[PDB]
Design a protein around this ligand. Sequence first.
Ligand SMILES: NC(=O)c1ccc[n+]([C@@H]2O[C@H](COP(=O)([O-])OP(=O)(O)OC[C@H]3O[C@@H](n4cnc5c(N)ncnc54)[C@H](OP(=O)(O)O)[C@@H]3O)[C@@H](O)[C@H]2O)c1
Ligand code: NA
Lengths: 220, 234
Amino acid sequence: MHNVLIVGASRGIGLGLADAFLQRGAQVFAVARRPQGSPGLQALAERAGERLQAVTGDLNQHDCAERIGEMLGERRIDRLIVNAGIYGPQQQDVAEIDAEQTAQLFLTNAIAPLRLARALSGRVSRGGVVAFMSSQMASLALGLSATMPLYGASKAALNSLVRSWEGEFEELPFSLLLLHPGWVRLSVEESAAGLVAAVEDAAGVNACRFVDYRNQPLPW
Amino acid sequence: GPLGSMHNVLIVGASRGIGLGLADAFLQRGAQVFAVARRPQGSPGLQALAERAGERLQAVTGDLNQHDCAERIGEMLGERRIDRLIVNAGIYGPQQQDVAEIDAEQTAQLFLTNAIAPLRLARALSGRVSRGGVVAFMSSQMASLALGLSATMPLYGASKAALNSLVRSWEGEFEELPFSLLLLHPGWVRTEMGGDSAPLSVEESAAGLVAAVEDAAGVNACRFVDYRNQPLPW
Ligand SMILES: NC(=O)c1ccc[n+]([C@@H]2O[C@H](COP(=O)([O-])OP(=O)(O)OC[C@H]3O[C@@H](n4cnc5c(N)ncnc54)[C@H](OP(=O)(O)O)[C@@H]3O)[C@@H](O)[C@H]2O)c1
Ligand code: NA
């Protein structure tokens, strides 16, 4: 049984990933801010029993890694998926975004994901996979983020920070993935099944990849 | 140029370093330069340029982080159009460049100063930019995802990737660009940010950047280029 850690698993694609990994036979550790308040996560917990361990945790809390670690004990993480993401201000307007909103956006979407992944990295299996939920809107070459520029810039910043982390290693000890889930309203189930296949395709490769739910590369 | 032409060049962040070098280099080409600085009176470099160029160098008090910056620049310009708009001002972020230690206040400061405020300002002045002009943002090779050189200064690099992203998103609002949009890498330059090991003088960096800016005039394109006018990958 692989150990899979999904950070941000109460709903949407995060929950879908927990479900999809469970269906492959993994032991899943599913972190959410309010796990008890997610009927989706509760339903998965009931069905999988002990194979789905819900964990209360918040990416933005500085003790998050410590709490996850204490919970995991000596168990190694085969697949670490950080499914951080907020939209930022609904108007996506550079003229109006304030300091508090800027901090929240870039901490949640870019900085805290790296802080957490780095802090847990000593537990990640060699030849495993660390993946971050990114977006097509992160791509500079595609340049598709005009209607949500702040969101897209936060995901470009995430991609940048992951590339910077890669640059700290002589050779990668695990793969580093930046994931585009597709434009899910495309079901969560199809997206998650695809993303699981993309993640598993990178296991043992120790490569940096920016890929979508079909395992197709996106340009930077 | 001919036809009694004298380009109006606006440099945001011109008190020292590359920004001052750009003001000097544009003045040497014959431009009317509007040099925006937080404390223009406290810059010996800008005072020296003012003495040499007289009225062809107008110092303007202004701060990229202030929401009235565009208004102050506009009031100063009157009805004049901007032929070249260069946003140079930027910060390094925390000295340690460490994702584990940066706090909320520092994160806001970094991304506002290096990414969001440049777009806020440029957008607010964009109606004044000449058709066939150039709007350029000082970016960095550390912004490039393909080069993956950002490990040296990850936070700074991420803030410039965010800048690049926002400029591309702005481009994507136009059916046809009315001016060029440039992301500039100045090289590693001997300034307070670059340090004593930097291989380029301000003078050579600025001369190169002026040539790259002028090479984009009338093209109405997006480019990510260095001080030699060589393209960088995204
Ligand atoms: N030097 C390099 O090697 C290098 C490499 C790549 C990219 N860059 C970029 O090039 C730009 C200029 O770099 P530099 O090396 O010349 O830095 P610098 O010598 O330290 O000068 C920074 C300039 O930015 C101004 N500034 C900072 N924050 C400002 C704000 N809110 N509002 C208005 N002005 C502000 C400063 O004015 P004050 O005097 O008031 O502080 C100063 O004129 C920056 O965007 C930097 O990121 C530099
Ligand atoms: Na003000």
